[PDB]
Amino acid sequence: FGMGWNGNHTELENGSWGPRFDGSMQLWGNVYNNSQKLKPYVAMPDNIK
C-alpha cells in the first residue's frame, strides 16, 4: 500500500496507510503556484536504500 490514512488515499501523509497500489495516476504533496505533482501510484522499494 501507499500514502494514506485510515486506509483512504491522501496527498500529504507521513505514512503508508492507503489504498492498494493501482498503478493509477494520483496526486501527492502540496499545491504550489496552482500546480501539483502527479505520479503513478506505484511502490518504490529501494526508496530508502
Binding site: 490514512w5 507521513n14 496507510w17
Partner: peptide, 10 residues
Amino acid sequence: GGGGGGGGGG
C-alpha cells in the same frame, strides 16, 4: 524522573 515521547501525525 522519566521522559516524554510524542506521537506523530496522520
